[PDB]
Design a protein around this ligand. Structure first.
Ligand code: HEM
Ligand SMILES: *[C@@H]1O[C@H](CO)[C@@H](O[C@@H]2O[C@H](CO)[C@@H](O)[C@H](O)[C@H]2NC(C)=O)[C@H](O)[C@H]1NC(C)=O
Ligand SMILES: *[C@@H]1O[C@H](CO)[C@@H](O[C@@H]2O[C@H](CO)[C@@H](O)[C@H](O)[C@H]2NC(C)=O)[C@H](O)[C@H]1NC(C)=O
Ligand SMILES: *[C@@H]1O[C@H](CO)[C@@H](O)[C@H](O)[C@H]1NC(C)=O
Ligand SMILES: *[C@@H]1O[C@H](CO)[C@@H](O)[C@H](O)[C@H]1NC(C)=O
Ligand SMILES: c1cncc(Oc2cccnc2)c1
Ligand SMILES: [Ca+2]
Length: 595
């Protein structure tokens, strides 16, 4: 008995039923329900939202209100007591390149984004939250526990604003609050091309009829392109260094400059689009701009799908991979391709894979300069270190030769993210990504850990001893129980990441189930999946089967020494080979001999 449904923020729908290309908004993928998987729609609810008032107030919002009879702990206290650690030694993943962490942030951004509510244009609402730490409406500040060092240097709280929700923006009252997903749910390279028509056009180079994506006209990388700058001010990339005054990049996705390796990944993707656009002109000089843009986009989207499903997921899900993501059988229109709310938290497992430093390496894969290695926090919203300090080639070698952090029950999230995160508009490198993850679980009305264990057909621990056995860790189970008196109350982000990893994977059972199911739906419910009969010719598919992340690098940098398997831990020069020994993406099958 759940209604026809609301959908006020989203406009009209008009589908061309013969189109060979995806829309920018994601609309029209599914023919029966053309809005499914479309951006700017509510995230799916795999389980009913759980709010303190059953409708919109997050747990923890009210002092006197218990969750199952107990107060929920402060997000920052959980972070300090369970998520933090001092010693970075021995914390690295002996078998995952830094590219593994990076590819995950990429895929993530291609799939979801629940932006903060916009109630700050010419408004002190945002200023007041920060300045006076007064909880109200969309201001839900993360307060400090009594013995927190930040209380001495940063004030009473870390500001936090509730995610935006569908239908109204001034309070509604009938059904549970549902947060928005601002990007397309399909793995379609929307992080490169955008999810709104407005932005999609602006990213394009219409000036010329070659199907190209716009490039920076102010800077170049030894002749190779850079993303254009986003000239919206205030710019956080300018803020972090007023001297260099280099602004953030403009990409298909809004968070592209959050950290230098992400920006780096976006640059590689753009170059790939243009290189494909140029190669297609040569094979089909008759094709117009639109035709070239779309066919290049199509090839790039398939690239991200293949790298993700064939290379990335197997080493994330490990032994659970075949269970949740059995080999492909074809497009199924009954499958819901929408990203679920819980998935946006399950995928945050990547936060425990980010290490404390980033390196620049030269062509011999040795330190590039006197400060080749830098602390991660000095790289948030840092674009000048790319434009004014070596370009992306050096950072990409670091991605290949350096390691990801390994999840560790005693060393979860690096202090660079847990104590030194920078957030636009605020002024300091003093935030905590972990605390924020937890406040956001509550903000989104996330059911607790046992609800999800149950959802996955896994036991549901009720006692310390049960939790110990599930976590296989006495001390961590003890701290969790002391913080949350019952496993029923454990926030999903933290409970899901506390479980030991499954054989050959990098996430526990619960998370493998949640991630596994979502990715299975993402593939099975995509009318444009690269392997779906009809989307690509069969000869074109034989050419796509050859793509690799190594080749993307060779084709789009001046790097000529790459590993064959980019995600595993690789050491130079042993595990490295010359680009010639690597499969190329042969584009002949795209020659349209139409005569
Ligand atoms: C240096 C590395 C990274 C930094 C500094 C960073 C920072 C952030 C921040 C600030 C947010 C928004 C939090 C909020 O307000 O709720 C976020 C969200 C998120 N991040 Fe990370 N992140 C990093 C890497 C990763 C990685 C490697 C992954 C996955 C493999 C990942 C997955 C996610 C997901 C799913 C979200 C929620 C996105 C949404 O649906 O809104 N992140 N990140
Ligand atoms: C749009 O595409 C055109 C063609 O690639 C770009 O213009 C040329 O500009 C380059 C330097 O960027 C010069 O070699 C020539 O003066 C132009 N070439 C031709 C064939 O006309 C233009 O820069 C692109 N614009 C953006 C914003 O990316
Ligand atoms: C801001 O960026 C500037 C400009 O790149 C940095 O200054 C450069 O750093 C060293 C000396 O400190 C030199 O090798 C460069 O040539 C400098 N250029 C100039 C114009 O000074 C500066 O260190 C950055 N500051 C911060 C806090 O990030
Ligand atoms: C299509 O999806 C539905 C619902 O997810 C599933 O139960 C059904 O088995 C699928 N149909 C086919 C032919 O695979
Ligand atoms: C390292 O990981 C790869 C997957 O990229 C795997 O096939 C290989 O066997 C692993 N090796 C070790 C020693 O763990
Ligand atoms: C706003 C603009 N740019 C980056 C922002 O932070 C991130 C970073 C990574 C993922 N999500 C959000 C926020
Ligand atoms: Ca997408």
């Amino acid at each position: 008995s759940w209604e026809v449904g609301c959908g006020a923020p989203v406009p009209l729908v008009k589908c061309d039923e013969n189109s060979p290309y995806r829309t920018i908004t994601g609309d029209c993928n599914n023919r029966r329900s053309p809005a499914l998987g479309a951006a700017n729609r509510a995230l799916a609810r795999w389980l009913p939202a759980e709010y303190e008032d059953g409708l919109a107030l997050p747990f923890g919002w009210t002092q006197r209100k218990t969750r199952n009879g107990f107060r929920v702990p402060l997000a920052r206290e959980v972070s300090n007591k369970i998520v933090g650690y001092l010693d970075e030694e021995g914390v690295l993943d002996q078998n995952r390149s830094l590219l593994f962490m990076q590819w995950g942030q990429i895929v993530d951004h291609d799939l979801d984004f629940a932006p903060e509510t916009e109630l700050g244009s010419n408004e002190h609402s945002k200023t007041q939250c920060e300045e006076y730490c007064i909880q109200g409406d969309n201001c839900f500040p993360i307060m400090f526990p009594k013995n927190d060092p930040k209380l001495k240097t940063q004030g009473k709280c870390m500001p936090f604003f509730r995610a935006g929700f569908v239908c109204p923006t001034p309070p509604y009252q009938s059904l549970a609050r549902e947060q928005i997903n601002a990007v397309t749910s399909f793995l379609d390279a929307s992080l490169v091309y955008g999810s709104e028509p407005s932005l999609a056009s602006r990213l394009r180079n219409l000036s010329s009829p070659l199907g190209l994506m716009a490039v920076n006209q102010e800077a170049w990388d030894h002749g190779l392109a850079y993303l254009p700058f986003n000239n919206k001010k205030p710019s956080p990339c300018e803020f972090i260094n007023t001297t260099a005054r280099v602004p953030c990049f403009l990409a298909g996705d809004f968070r592209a400059s959050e950290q230098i390796l992400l920006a780096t990944a976006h640059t590689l993707l753009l170059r790939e689009h243009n290189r494909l656009a140029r190669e297609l002109k040569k094979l089909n000089p008759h094709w117009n701009g639109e035709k070239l843009y779309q066919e290049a986009r199509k090839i790039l989207g398939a690239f991200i799908q293949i790298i993700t499903f064939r290379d990335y997921l197997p080493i994330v899900l490990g032994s659970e991979m075949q269970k949740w993501i059995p080999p492909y059988q074809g497009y199924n229109n009954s499958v819901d391709p929408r990203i679920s709310n819980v998935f946006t938290f399950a995928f945050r497992f990547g936060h425990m894979e980010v290490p404390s430093t980033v390196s620049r390496l030269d062509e011999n894969y040795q330190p590039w300069g006197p400060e080749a290695e830098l602390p991660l926090h000095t790289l948030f919203f840092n674009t000048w270190r790319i434009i004014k300090d070596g370009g992306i080639d050096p950072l990409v070698r670091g991605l290949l030769a350096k390691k990801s952090k390994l999840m560790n029950q005693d060393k979860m999230v690096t202090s660079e993210l847990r104590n030194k995160l920078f957030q636009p508009t605020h002024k300091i490198h003093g935030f905590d990504l972990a605390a924020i993850n937890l406040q956001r679980c509550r903000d989104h009305g996330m059911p607790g850990y046992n609800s999800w264990r149950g959802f996955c057909g896994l036991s549901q621990p009720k006692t310390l001893k049960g939790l110990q056995t599930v976590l296989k860790n006495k001390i961590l189970a003890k701290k969790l129980m002391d913080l949350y008196k019952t496993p029923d109350n454990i926030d999903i982000w933290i409970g899901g990441n506390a479980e030991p990893m499954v054989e050959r994977g990098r996430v526990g059972p619960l998370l493998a189930c949640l991630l596994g199911r979502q990715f299975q739906q993402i593939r099975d419910g995509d009318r444009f999946w690269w392997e779906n009969p009809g989307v690509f010719t069969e000869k074109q598919r034989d050419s796509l089967q050859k793509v690799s992340f190594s080749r993307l690098i060779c084709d789009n940098t001046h790097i000529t020494k790459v590993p064959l398997h980019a995600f595993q831990a690789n050491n130079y020069p042993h595990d490295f080979v010359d680009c010639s020994t690597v499969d190329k993406l042969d584009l002949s099958p795209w020659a349209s001999r139409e005569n």
